Each structure stands twice: as structure tokens, then as C-alpha cells.
Amino acid sequence: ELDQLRQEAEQLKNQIRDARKACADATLSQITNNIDPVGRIQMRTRRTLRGHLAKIYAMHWGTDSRLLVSASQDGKLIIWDSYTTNKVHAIPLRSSWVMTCAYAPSGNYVACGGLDNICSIYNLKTREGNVRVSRELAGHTGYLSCCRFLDDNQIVTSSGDTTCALWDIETGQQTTTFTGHTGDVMSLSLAPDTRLFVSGACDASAKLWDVREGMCRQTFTGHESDINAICFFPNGNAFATGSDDATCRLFDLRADQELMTYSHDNIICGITSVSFSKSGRLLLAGYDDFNCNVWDALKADRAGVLAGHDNRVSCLGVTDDGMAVATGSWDSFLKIWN
Amino acid sequence: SIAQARKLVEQLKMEANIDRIKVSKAAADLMAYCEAHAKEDPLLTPVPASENPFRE
Amino acid sequence: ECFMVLNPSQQLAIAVLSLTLGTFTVLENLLVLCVILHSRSLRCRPSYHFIGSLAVADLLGSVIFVYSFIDFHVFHRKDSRNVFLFKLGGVTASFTASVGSLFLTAIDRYISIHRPLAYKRIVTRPKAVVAFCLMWTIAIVIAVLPLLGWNCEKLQSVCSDIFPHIDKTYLMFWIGVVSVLLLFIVYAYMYILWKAHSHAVRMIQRGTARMDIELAKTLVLILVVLIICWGPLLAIMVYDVFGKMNKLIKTVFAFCSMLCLLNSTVNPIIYALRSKDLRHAFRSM
Amino acid sequence: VQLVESGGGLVQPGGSRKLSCSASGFAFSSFGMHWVRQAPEKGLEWVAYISSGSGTIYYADTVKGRFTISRDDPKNTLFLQMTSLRSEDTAMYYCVRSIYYYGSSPFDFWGQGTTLTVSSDIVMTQATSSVPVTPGESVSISCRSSKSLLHSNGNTYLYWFLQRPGQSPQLLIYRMSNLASGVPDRFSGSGSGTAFTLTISRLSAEDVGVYYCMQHLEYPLTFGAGTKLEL
Amino acid sequence: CTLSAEDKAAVERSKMIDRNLREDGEKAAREVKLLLLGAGESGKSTIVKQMKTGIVETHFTFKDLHFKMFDVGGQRSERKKWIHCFEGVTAIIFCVALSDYDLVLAEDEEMNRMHESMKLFDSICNNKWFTDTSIILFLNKKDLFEEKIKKSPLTICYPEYAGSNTYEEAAAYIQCQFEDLNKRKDTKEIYTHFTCATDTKNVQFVFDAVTDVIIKNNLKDCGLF
Ligand SMILES: CC(C)(CCCCCCN=C=S)c1cc(O)c2c(c1)OC(C)(C)[C@@H]1CC[C@@H](CO)C[C@@H]21
């Protein structure tokens, strides 16, 4: 019967709720007292990357912490040098509705997908000079929300038809397919060892997946609305979120429940992308009221504000060495906040 | 939705059987991660323009 | 030759007025020059440089005028050339740059209804500051030109009686190079009220008048301010090539000099208060 | 990807000739192109340069004013009109392509090179003779500048070229330590400042040829006289 | 400028990339980007056949004006999470089939098909993004609308109608049940047109109504309005 299975599933929901309550002996906010607070961190705009002409919807730092791809809502995908703010490439995309962007961690490839449901993969370091499309990864139904390279041949593209996927670039077919979400998937983040990834969604639930196994390890819940930001802790054992009830939550993969919450009562707006710092002490979350504000990650004190943008900060990225923070907004500028 | 109602429970049984450690130990290494690596974080303490690439 | 004519008791009335209306226009202009640069949504629209150019020119030209106007018309204190001639040359630089900026806002709104699909490309912050600067710098070199061209002290010309050191050979140039563009403004705002008239008839003759009469209120009230102020001001000073130059003309022309700051007082009302995109920033702040 | 060259012949001194290279196989309009000549018993020597979009043209001081480098980017050809040529302008005139962005490899492709016979500044000092060597041997080929090549941005602008004889030189080490695409990993460059070494750890007989170093700090743009290798 | 020979030539690449974005940000500013919304079973395919995956950009020129229409009906995803991509469109072309006043949708409980296209209309007028973007509204299939209003009245889809089974008494009733769904009668205009086989005068309506939007958007960009 369909009725007795819903009679059973809530008991398993009542068993996971009891098991997480058997482990919540001490809150993180009371363990993370009796330590030094981080104090106010002020970060000034060091660069402004100007050349876009529409809403920057995504960016991704290249793994050398100097290059920077940035997909915006014209047909362009500009690869910025950051240290002397030149444009290394400008890649005219085939559909100008791109909701995501990814720099491959070898430097060679760059992917961007969007409302065309297709994850085009570009080959920068080539022989004939110009940046060339190597693949167009079809096969999703809804819009693409986030693309992430594991290496130069696997890419994890979470789309909006309630499904993530794992691709093989050299062939062009989905190897696995991570389903189990209700409602859209809005952002993913690979673990720093690239074995697991989480995937925030529009049913207020992140979900820890395994790229080798093929289905969900554990499903986190606790938000009130659409989760549209995910960042792993740099340890790779916890992860933040960000949602449209204007609150972050630091979850944990080993305790299977959220550890703290990041809400100020003077913000009501919603979150577009979060990102930890190096060492996992800051939780720089990008909000709809045009400002990032650096939460301390252990105590919920809002330890600064990166207001320099004239519209919604819709993409946020900390370098792989932690030397700078690049945010990009719905006005076409992309300020780098060292 | 008989097939959908089974797949929700086959996952939930496998999700319930997970060795959960405590928040007393899930946070004591998240604390131990930051305090070990706060020397390597150029956003907690501002290191000067001598070690900054983004000075000018 | 000096022209010591002064009203007996009417002099202090208009001098503390222009000291205060010249501050009543600074209170009228302070919250427009600030709001046009405070608000991040307003500066990036390129026509607001022209409303910005009119903003400074009616503060660079209101308060430099009035001290040049009150101290001349209390005891005639300033009696040299350099304490006088450069000072009005600063005044007629701004009030050339103001009506220069009124010309820029007129051609800005001219092509935005003549060539409507191409206005967004043409008037851009590259091409905005192209003409935002050159009209300002050809104002002053058309203004401090008698310091570097003809003085009646420096050379032989017909010395005007309206202005002591500025010649009648200058006031076919300056009334030229104001009214060559002040006649363009009343054509520019005539085409707007006709190209909207040919538009407003068409959206009813198609179906599914009313467009232009919303615009015509806030157009002729601009178009008469360029006539209720710059009209009788330029109507008096054309007599200098002519043969009127009477004392009652010299009496009443002093009572139309402060119309040029009354122009400057009502110009942010007809340009910034009509701006709904500026009006909410006045509501917000 | 090839860069074939036209022109060539035997003009009288005082005469003129127009070299042209037809570049095909790459997006030619975004490549800064060069001309590099090689006197027939000697090493390489730099002649001219044109940028992407022809927006910046340099010349060497020996051929400044007489030579005009130009190109037609829709035609995918790059010219060099030489006027009032001397008897020292007899060389094989290679064309080079070089794209400059962050992390690019300039001078990566060299043209065939047409001989143009005629009828009769940083200095790079290699100074090493035709070294006889057995394969499998570690060879250190050392160049030496007259300036500290390490720029303020941390890049050391030294390039290492292998001209196998009968061919055009090819890039090996496209900055201080880097390696061109296609060079086997046994080649390695080392050093900083003024003394640089190209160390081929394992050897063969296929990488025999003469080895030029080149600086790239500023557009004098001189080559070293090549350390010849032989078996 | 303490730049090397390659650092100088890298900036010359950045400046000749900037010169190709600005030269392609003017080929993109000359075009008019519409947005063909509408519910299912409306006749959006009737309109993109009258002119010329997920999104499908349709290009067509009229009187030296290059249009672009983005039919996002093939998305089948959440409309909330990508409708801010079209925040700066010129004019939302809407489509309402007049002929679905008596048809119902079998999925939801009551689900009159006209009752949901009215509810999508209220959901895109009153978006926080579509404040300025003036809706062009195409009431499709008026020829099929007469040949079933002589049989069946409009009182099915709307109880609050008091009129006879005639076209003009009821076709204008639907327009005044659509033109008042916006709570912004001051910020945007709703242009309405009754397309059946009117295939010459539908792009002419869009060219006229976009030129009305282009003019009024210019006169607020100048401040004059
Ligand atoms: C701004 C405006 C309306 C016209 C300027 C342009 C005139 C063309 C010549 N440009 C040149 S050069 C103007 C009108 C005036 O009536 C006066 C003005 C300025 O300035 C002061 C206060 C110095 C005058 C003092 C002497 C007064 C005679 O009793 C006349 C006063």
C-alpha cells in the first residue's frame, strides 16, 4: 500500500530525528565561546574587473589563484588576470543565458551552462590560438545551476530538473546520475578530496552524495526555504548553506545535523552564494541587499561587511590560497577584496 | 507513486544507519582546524602589502 | 568714464534679496548637486552630467554674481579693471555654461524622440563627457576673451554704457553665441512636443491626446522659463548696438539682472523635481 | 598551423623585395608576428615585429627605417617590404608567431624561411663550441645575459630554441623554467638573473642541433650565438 | 610604465579584447529583446510562425529593427529561479487563448485554463523584476472565439459577467479582466491585441507597441517624463 509506506517513512524520520538529538549534547556556539573572537575584519576593494556589460551571474577562481573566469548575461565569459587586471580571453557563448561557470583545476578547460540546459566546455590552452568549444554536454531537462570540474574529464553539473549528474567530457554521456531531490538543485560543492559533494536545493535540503557510489549518503534538512548556496568547510567535513530565509547554517557530515545558524535580525533578504575562507573561520555570504558580510564561522558575530556593489552580489569566491575574495554582482563589476 | 514511495524508504533506512559522532567531537575538530590553520589565512590577519599580490 | 547711476532706496531692497535669494537658490541647488552624485542609480545615466553641468553652473554663477552685484550697487567699491572685468568674466562664463548646459539637455532630449531607437547608443558616458567638457571650456574662452581680446582700456572700440570695459563689438558676439543656441532650445522642445504629438495621435488611431499633454505641462513650463528670464534680459541688451541706452533702461536692466539667478532658482525645479527618478531619492534621503 | 613564406631571390643592393608569409591553420589576427633572420654561416638575429591588430610595430636598429613590416589580417598574410637593402641583409628570413597573454608561450611556431641572397641592448653570451656528446648524457647549455632578466613581476624572460640543421628553430623553454607544448620533459632550464642553464638530462641524437637563447625584457630582442651540439 | 615587453603586449591584448566587447555590446544594444510568455495551449507557436532545449531565441527584423523573442515555455522548471534573467527585456509579449474560457485543465481540481493564464498574468505583472517592462498582451484565437460563444457563454469562466452571448460585449470583457490584474497602472502599460488570422498586423502591433515602450523608456531616461 502507498499509505503504509508513508506510515513507515515518518518513523524513519522519527528515528533519524532521535539519533541526531542523541548526539546534540553541546551546541557549537557554547563550545566556541571561551575563545578569542575574530574581531572586525575590514577588507578594501583592491581590483575592479570592469569589462562585462550585463549581470555577472557566476565566477570561479582558477586554481592558480590568479586567473578568474566570469560568466555574465551577455554572450561573454571573460578570463581575467587578477594581479594586473587584464582580460586573458573573452569567449563568446552560444546562448547568452548562463547561470553558472567553472574553471577546471588544471587551467585548461572552462565550462559554463545556463538556461539552454547545456554545459559547454571550452578548451583554452590550445594550438590554433582561439578558445574552442570541446564539448556541449546535453541531456538535462531544466536549467543548469552549477558545474564543477573534478578533473579534466569529469564534471558534476547540477541542474534544475531536481537532478545532479556526473559527466565524462571525452565521451559526452552521464556516467552516474544523482537523483532524489524534490524541486530544483541550486548549487553544489565538491569536497576538497573530490570524493563527495553536497547539493543544495529548493526543498530546503542539502544532500551529501558520493561520486563513486551514485546515491545519497545522508540528507540534511533545517532550512525554511530554497537553499541556493553551498560551500564545503576547508576540512571537508562540514559545509555551510545559504537560503532565501536570509540565514546560513553550518551543517556537519559526521554529526548529520547543523551546528550553528547565521542570522542577523537586521537582514531579511536572502543569500546568493556563500564561501568559507581558508582555515574555515570566515563564512563570507553574499546577500540580496547588495552586500557580502563576513560571518565568523564559529561564533555567529557578523565580523564585517563588504558593501561595494550597486546590485545583488550573485557570485562569491575565495582563492585557493586565501589571499583574496572576489565577488561579482548584477552590475557588471567584479571587485576583488583582499 | 508506489515506486516513488519505496525509493524514499530504501534511502531512509540506509540514511538512518549512519554512525553519528557527537557535536562535542564534531565541533572540537572544526575548532581544531581553524586554530591550527589561522596562520595560513590571509583574511583573518591582514598581512601587509609586502606579502599581498593585490597591492597595485 | 564712470556710470555712477544708483537707485536711492531700491538698491538695498534688491541687494539683500539677491543676497538671500542667491542663498535661497543655493539651498535649492545643494540638494540636487548632492543627490545627483550620492545616488548610485542616477550618476550612470549620461544625461545627468548635463543636469550636473547645470547644477554647478548655477552655483558657480549665482554666488559669484551676487557679491559682484551687491558691492557694485552699494557704493561702487570695485573701481579697477581686474577687480571687475575678470569677475563678470567669471559670471558670464557660468551663465554661458548654464545655457550651454541647457543646450546639451535640449539636444539630449531632441534625439531621444527624433531618433528613439538610437538614443541609448549615441548618448553614452564616453560621448557624454565629450560635449560636457568642451561646451564648458568654450564658454570661458568666450567669456574671459575681452581679458585676452578687446578692452576699451586696451584698444580702440566703442565702449558700451551698459558694461564699462566691455565693448559693443562684443555684444553682437555674446548675444549671438547665446541666442544661436537659445533659439535651438525652443526648436528642440518644439520637435519633442510634435514628435510626441505625431506619436500620441497614432496610439489612438491604432487603438488600445493623452501621451503628449502629460509631457506638455512639464515642457512649456521649461520653455517659458527660458523666455520669462532670458527674454527681457536679452531684449534690453540688444539696445547697445541701437540708440536707446536711456537711464530708465539702465534703471530697469539692473532689475532684470537678478532674473538670471531667478532662472537659476527655478531651473532645478523644472529639471530635478520633474525627474521622478530623482524625486524618490529626495523621498528616500 | 604552418607558416609558409614567399619572396626571396637575388636583388642588387639598392634594390627592393617584398617577403610575405601566408599563415594558415590558426587564428592569425590575434598573434603578434615577427621576422627573424639568420645569416648563412651565423646564428639568428631579430628584424621586426607587428602586434595583434598591427597596433604596435618595433624594428631592430640595423633595419630601422628601411624595412616596413605590415600585414592584412583578413588576408592571413604578413609582409616585409625591404627597401635599399645592404649586403648584410642576406639571410634566411624566418617568420615567427607569438601570442602574449598570461601564461602563453611566445615564439612557439617558426616558419619555413626563405633565403634572400644579395649580390656582393641586452647582449646574450653563450660562447660554447660544437660540443661533442654521446647520447644519454646530461648536457648543460649555458646562456648569460648582460642584465638581470628577472623582471619586477617575478618572470625571467629567457627563451630556449633548438634549431635542428636543415630546419627552423623551435621553442623549448618558453620562460625561465617552462616547457613548450611538444618538447619532451627531459629538457629543463634553470638559473635566474644573468646565468641560465638549459640542462638536457637524458639525451638522444634526435635533439642534435644548435641551441639559441633569447631575451624578451625589451625590444632590442637579441639572441645568443648558439651552442652547437654534435655526436 | 614598469611593464616588460610581454606585460606591455598583454595589455594590448586586453585593450583589443575590450574593443571587441564594446563593439559587440553595441550590436546587442541595437536589438530589442522581447519575452514570449504565456500558459500552455495558448498559441505561442501561432505567433512565432507569424514572425519567423530550454530557451529558444527567435530573431526577426521589421522596419530596420532587430527583434529577439525568448520562448521559455519549454523550460518545465521553477519560474521563480530564472525569471530575473529577463529583468531588462523591452516588453513581455503575453499570450492568452480566448478559446480556453470553456475548456478546463484536468490536472488541478477546478482548473479553468483561462483561470490559470489569468493567474500567471498576475504573477508576472507583479514580479519585483517586471515593474517597468510593459506587457504586450495577445488575445489569441478570436476567430475560434466567435464560433463557440454563439453556443456557450462566458458565464462559465466568470460568474460576474452580465451580458449577452456576443463577441464584442465579451471579448472586451476579458481584456478588462486582464488589464486590471496589474497593481502597477502607473509604472507599466498593457497593450492588448486580438489576433486570429491577423498575420500581417501582428508584427506591426509589436513594432508599434515596442516603439511606444522605447519612447517612454527614453523620456524617463532623460528625466522628461
Ligand atoms: C549675468 C548677466 C545677466 C549677463 C552677463 C553677460 C553680459 C554680456 C557681457 N559679458 C561679457 S564679457 C549680468 C547682468 C548684469 O546686469 C550685471 C552682471 C551680469 O554682472 C555684474 C554684476 C558684474 C554687472 C555689474 C554692473 C551692472 C551695471 O550697473 C550690471 C551687472
| Cell reading at A71 | 560568466
Centre a 10 Å sphere on the Cβ of residue E64 and count the other Cβ atoms it contains: 7
How many Å apart are CA E127 and CA A76, to the nearest integer? 27
How many Å apart are CA D185 and CA D132, to the nearest integer? 22
Closest CA to A55 of A98, A90, A112, A115: A98
Is residue C124 a contact partner of residue C46, using CB atoms and an 8 Å limit?
yes
| Cell reading at C212 | 503628449
Closest CA to A68 of A54, A84, A53, A92: A84
Terminal C-alpha separation, chain A: 59
How many Å apart are CA D40 and CA D85, to the nearest integer? 16
Touching pair A, E by Cβ (3+ pairs < 8 Å):
yes
Terminal C-alpha separation, chain D: 32
What does the CA dihedral D39, D41, D44, D46 come to, rounded to 10 degrees? -20
Q: Which method resolved this structure?
A: cryo-EM
How many Å apart are CA E99 and CA E144, to the nearest integer? 6
Phi, psi of E137 (to 5 degrees): -120, 120
Phi, psi of E19 (to 5 degrees): -70, -10
| Total number of domains constituting chain B | 1
Centre a 10 Å sphere on the Cβ of residue A224 and count the other Cβ atoms it contains: 11
Helix/strand/coil (H, E, C) string of chain A?
Answer: CHHHHHHHHHHHHHHHHHHHHCCCCCCHHHHCCCCCCCCCCCCCEEEEECCCCCCEEEEEECCCCCEEEEEECCCCEEEEECCCCCEEEECCCCCCCECCCEECCCCCEEEECECCCCEEEEECCCCCCCCEEEEEECCCCCCEEEEEECCCCEEEEEECCCECCEEECCCCCEEECCECCCCCEEEEEECCCCCEEEEEECCCCCEEEECCCCCCCEECCCCCCCEEEEEECCCCCEEEEEECCCCEEEEECCCCCCCEEECCCCCCCCEEEEEECHHHCEEEEEECCCEEEEEECCCCCECCCEECCCCCEEEEEECCCCCCEEEEECCCCEEEEC
| Cell reading at C183 | 533659439
How many Å apart are CA E36 and CA E56, to the nearest integer? 10
Closest CA to A27 of B19, B18, B22: B22
D61, exposed or middle or buried, with CB in 10 Å at 0-12, 13-18, 19+? exposed
Query: Strand, coil or helix: what is E59?
Result: strand
How many Å apart are CA B9 and CA B3, to the nearest integer? 10
Amino acid at E54: G
The full DSSP string for C63-106 is: HHHHHHHHTTTTS----SSTTTHHHHHHHHHHHHHHHHHHHHHH
How many Å apart are CA C59 and CA C55, to the nearest integer? 7
In the sheet where D3-5 sits, what is the strand order? Answer: D3-5, D16-23, D77-83, D67-72
The DSSP 8-state label assigned to residue E153 in this structure reads -
Is the Cα dihedral C37, C42, C44, C45 positive or negative? negative
Mutate to test the pocket of ligand 1, among C92, C145, C167 (most ligand atoms within 8 A of CB): C92
Confirm or reject: Cβ of C61 under 6 Å from ligand 1: no
- Buried b / exposed e over A283-317, threshold 16 CB at 10 Å, is bbbbbbebbbbbbbbbbbebbbebebbebbbbbbb
Is residue A178 a contact partner of residue A196, using CB atoms and an 8 Å limit?
no
Q: How far is CA C129 from CA A128, A150, C45, C101, C126, in A?
A: 41, 48, 12, 12, 6
The angle, 0 to 180 degrees and rounded to 10, between the axes of the packed helices E167-178 and E113-125 is 40
Is residue A204 a contact partner of residue A185, using CB atoms and an 8 Å limit?
no
Distance of CA A293 to the CA centre of its chain: 16
How many Å apart are CA D48 and CA D59, to the nearest integer? 4
Q: Give the residue whose CA is nearest to atom 15 of ligand 1.
A: C257
Provide the pairing of β-strand E31-36 with E91-97. Answer: parallel
Terminal C-alpha separation, chain C: 53
The DSSP 8-state label assigned to residue C167 in this structure reads B
Amino acid at C213: I
E125, exposed or middle or buried, with CB in 10 Å at 0-12, 13-18, 19+? buried
A102, exposed or middle or buried, with CB in 10 Å at 0-12, 13-18, 19+? buried
How many Å apart are CA E48 and CA E62, to the nearest integer? 14
Is residue A277 a contact partner of residue A38, using CB atoms and an 8 Å limit?
no
The DSSP 8-state label assigned to residue E91 in this structure reads E
How many Å apart are CA E7 and CA E20, to the nearest integer? 20
Helix/strand/coil (H, E, C) string of chain D?
Answer: CCEEECCCEEECCCCEEEEEEEECCCCHHHCEEEEEEECCCCCEEEEEEECHHHCCEEECCCCCCCEEEEEECCCCEEEEEEECCCCCCCEEEEEEEECCCCCCCCCCEECCCEEEEECCCCCCCCCCCCEECCCCCCEEEEEECCCCCECCCCCECEEEEEECCCCCCEEEECCCCCCCCCCCCCEEEEEECCEEEEEECCCCCCCCCEEEEEECCCCCCCECCCEEEEC
How many Å apart are CA A291 and CA A286, to the nearest integer? 6
Is the Cα dihedral C110, C111, C112, C114 positive or negative? positive
> For residue B12, what is the nearest residue in chain A, using CA coordinates?
A12
CATH number of the CATH domain containing B28: 4.10.260.10
Query: Strand, coil or helix: what is E150?
Result: coil
Is residue D118 a contact partner of residue D87, using CB atoms and an 8 Å limit?
yes
Range of the domain at B41: 1-56
Confirm or reject: Cβ of C230 under 6 Å from ligand 1: no
Q: How far is CA A78 from CA A87, A112, A332, D85, in A?
A: 7, 11, 12, 45
Query: Strand, coil or helix: what is E195?
Result: strand
Is residue C165 a contact partner of residue C78, using CB atoms and an 8 Å limit?
no
Q: How many residues does chain B have?
A: 56
- For the stretch C213-220, contacts whose Cβ atoms lie closer than 8 Å and that sit 24 or more positions apart, written own/partner, are C214/E225, C215/E219, C215/E224, C215/E225, C218/C270, C218/C274, C218/E224, C219/C189, C219/C192, C219/C193, C219/E224, C220/C193
Across the strands, what pairs with D46?
Answer: D36
Closest CA to D50 of D98, D17, D104: D98
Is the Cα dihedral E139, E143, E146, E152 positive or negative? negative
Give the contacts of E20 (CB within 8 A, at least 6 positions apart).
A90
Confirm or reject: Cβ of C260 under 6 Å from ligand 1: yes
> For residue E26, what is the nearest residue in chain C, using CA coordinates?
C121
Amino acid at A17: R
Dmax (CA) for chain B in angstroms is 65
Is residue C51 a contact partner of residue C42, using CB atoms and an 8 Å limit?
no
Closest CA to A71 of A338, A284, A330: A330
Is residue A119 a contact partner of residue A101, using CB atoms and an 8 Å limit?
no
Mutate to test the pocket of ligand 1, among C69, C151, C240 (most ligand atoms within 8 A of CB): C69
Q: Within the 107-126 window of chain A, which residues sit less than 8 Å (CB to CB) from chain E?
A: 115-118
Is residue E59 a contact partner of residue E23, using CB atoms and an 8 Å limit?
no
Q: How far is CA A47 from CA A44, A84, A327, in A?
A: 9, 9, 11
Centre a 10 Å sphere on the Cβ of residue A7 and count the other Cβ atoms it contains: 10
Provide the pairing of β-strand A77-81 with A67-72. Answer: antiparallel
Is residue E140 a contact partner of residue E42, using CB atoms and an 8 Å limit?
yes
Is residue C211 a contact partner of residue C200, using CB atoms and an 8 Å limit?
yes
The partner residue sitting opposite E215, judged by closest CB among C48, C113, C272, is: C113
Residue whose entry in the numeric block shows the C-alpha cell 470583457: E173
How many Å apart are CA C237 and CA C234, to the nearest integer? 5
How many Å apart are CA D18 and CA E168, to the nearest integer? 79
Across the strands, what pairs with E195?
Answer: E140
Give the contacts of C261 (CB within 8 A, at least 6 positions apart).
C18, C21, C22, C25, C58, C61, C62, C65, C66
Instruction: Count Cβ–Cβ pairs < 8 Å, chain A vs chain B.
Output: 158
Q: Catalogue the E-assigned strands of chain E.
A: 31-36, 57-61, 66-70, 91-97, 135-140, 190-195
The DSSP 8-state label assigned to residue C165 in this structure reads S
Centre a 10 Å sphere on the Cβ of residue C222 and count the other Cβ atoms it contains: 22
Confirm or reject: Cβ of C90 under 6 Å from ligand 1: no
| Cell reading at E22 | 564594446
C216, exposed or middle or buried, with CB in 10 Å at 0-12, 13-18, 19+? middle
Centre a 10 Å sphere on the Cβ of residue A170 and count the other Cβ atoms it contains: 10
Q: How far is CA E59 from CA A57, A98, D164, E83, E217, in A?
A: 24, 19, 55, 20, 22
Residues of C in contact with E192 (CB under 8 A): 208
Provide the pairing of β-strand D109-110 with D91-98. Answer: antiparallel
Closest CA to A197 of A161, A148, A250: A148
Neighbours of chain D (3+ CB pairs under 8 A): A, E
Confirm or reject: Cβ of C85 under 6 Å from ligand 1: no
Say whether B22 and A323 touch across the interface (CB within 8 A). Answer: no
Query: Strand, coil or helix: what is C144?
Result: coil
Give the contacts of B34 (CB within 8 A, at least 6 positions apart).
A279, A280, A281, A297, A298
Q: How many residues does chain D have?
A: 231
How many Å apart are CA E197 and CA A283, to the nearest integer? 58
Residue whose entry in the numeric block shows the C-alpha cell 654521446: D134
Phi, psi of C24 (to 5 degrees): -65, -25
Closest CA–CA distance from residue A202 to any residue of chain E (Å) = 9
Helix/strand/coil (H, E, C) string of C226-267?
Answer: HHHCHHHHHHHHHHHCCCCCCHHHHHHHCCCCCHHHHHHHHH
Across the strands, what pairs with A306?
Answer: A292
Give the contacts of A171 (CB within 8 A, at least 6 positions apart).
none
Residue whose entry in the numeric block shows the C-alpha cell 452571448: E165
Is residue D158 a contact partner of residue D125, using CB atoms and an 8 Å limit?
no
Domains and CATH numbers, chain A: 1-338 (2.130.10.10)
Is the Cα dihedral A221, A223, A229, A233 positive or negative? negative
Across the strands, what pairs with D11?
Answer: D118
Q: What is the resolution of this structure in A?
A: 3.0
The angle, 0 to 180 degrees and rounded to 10, between the axes of the packed helices B2-16 and A2-21 is 20
How many Å apart are CA A103 and CA A106, to the nearest integer? 8
| Residue list, annotated binding site of E for GTP | 41-46, 71-75, 140-143, 197
How many Å apart are CA C113 and CA C134, to the nearest integer? 24
Residue whose entry in the numeric block shows the C-alpha cell 555577472: A56
Domains and CATH numbers, chain D: 1-119 (no CATH), 120-225 (2.60.40.10)
